[PDB]
Swiss-Prot record:
Lineage, uppermost ranks: Eukaryota, Fungi, Dikarya, Ascomycota, Taphrinomycotina
The WD repeat ranges on this chain: 125-167, 170-206
Gene3D superfamilies in alphabetical order: YVTN repeat-like/Quinoprotein amine dehydrogenase
Predominant subcellular localization, coarse grouping: cytoplasm
UniProt name for this protein: Uncharacterized WD repeat-containing protein C4F10.18
Lineage: superkingdom: Eukaryota
Location relative to the cell: Cytoplasm; Nucleus
Length: 345
């Protein structure tokens, strides 16, 4: 099954290899910003109204000197039209296995916090996320960064008003994904390589030597008959959980014999990158055959209908939904595509 669509392709400069793509969805005023992490930093594009639809305009490049492998925007990002200045707050992972908070005025990094050495991860970092925690008086109490790696550790990095607070929690296998809960930054979900899914409230024990800080542990292993690709909250309130295996087997739990998933299925292709849930419709998610350049659109509650909107004929590096739910940004090895699915308009 195909879909009616329109795509624009923008070449990256010849010496630039992309690694990751993300929209600045966490901050409404900056929701049209697209970031591409590449071999020498982060390039920021701006999606604007053109016939109809969107076009990409490169704004600037944040220089880091090494590849950026994972990236997450903060809700603290803001725009001011004085000399237009974007004040960005980026959480990212770099080739040197550091976890970073990058604070910019346009391309200029005015402040940077780097977690490495003995304090950070001792192996490859696989995923990162960031959340803003507000006081009872509605002020920015702290910014919290969560990261997981092949050192089988979840690191909670809290940047508070009075210095950083650092905490590490053991995993039973490499951490392969992490994400704060929508509408509740006190909670997050962690995907382990072995199929374990940890749900965690990191504010509860603020009781040191504890192998079980977790609130709840789900598990894909007894349900799929290889390693876990990712796990994501779905819903604006995180009322559901979507897990995807590398094989293409996906599982969905709704939170509100209720021991099995509410529904599961298997994608047409393997999913090296995992699932990318739709911003507006819980039932929909996108998954890619990254090596062959295909993207399948799956509805979890729909009949077994095979919908493949995108075929590129070249490898896909990363992709992500625009917050409007009709646009996808797709990175290939030498370009970025802006694709508009007409069915979602």
């Amino acid at each position: 099954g195909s879909m009616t669509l329109s795509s624009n392709q923008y070449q990256l400069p010849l010496n630039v290899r992309p690694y990751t793509t993300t929209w600045c969805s966490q901050s409404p005023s900056c929701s049209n910003l697209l970031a591409i992490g590449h071999d020498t930093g982060i390039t920021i594009y701006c999606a604007s109204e053109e016939s109809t639809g969107l076009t990409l305009q490169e704004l600037f490049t944040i220089q880091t000197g090494l590849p950026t492998l994972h990236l997450s925007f903060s809700s603290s990002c803001s725009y001011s039209e004085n000399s237009p200045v974007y004040s960005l707050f980026l959480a990212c992972v770099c080739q040197d296995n550091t976890v970073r908070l990058i604070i910019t005025k346009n391309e200029t990094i005015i402040t940077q916090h780097v977690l490495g050495g003995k304090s950070g991860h001792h192996n490859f970092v696989n995923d990162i996320d960031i959340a803003d925690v507000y006081s009872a008086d509605n002020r920015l109490a702290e910014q919290v960064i969560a990261s997981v790696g092949d050192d089988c550790t979840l690191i909670i990095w809290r940047l508070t008003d009075e210095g950083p607070i650092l905490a590490g929690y053991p995993l039973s296998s490499p951490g392969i994904s992490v994400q704060f809960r929508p509408s509740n930054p006190n909670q997050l979900i962690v995907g382990e390589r072995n199929g374990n899914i940890r749900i965690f409230d990191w504010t509860l024990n603020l009781t040191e030597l504890v192998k079980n800080p977790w609130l709840l542990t789900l598990n894909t292993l007894p349900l799929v008959n290889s390693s876990l690709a990712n796990v994501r909250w779905i819903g604006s309130d995180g009322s559901g959980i979507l897990a995807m295996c590398k094989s293409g087997a996906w599982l969905r739990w709704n939170l509100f014999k209720n021991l099995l998933p509410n529904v599961q299925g298997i994608s047409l292709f393997p999913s090296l990158l995992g699932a990318c849930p739709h911003p507006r419709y819980m039932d929909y998610f996108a998954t890619a055959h990254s090596q062959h350049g295909l993207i399948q659109l799956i509805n979890t509650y729909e009949k077994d209908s095979n919908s493949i909107p995108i075929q590129l004929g070249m490898p896909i590096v990363d992709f992500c939904w625009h917050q409007d739910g009709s646009h996808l940004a797709i990175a290939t090895e030498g370009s970025v595509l802006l694709t508009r699915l007409m069915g979602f308009t």
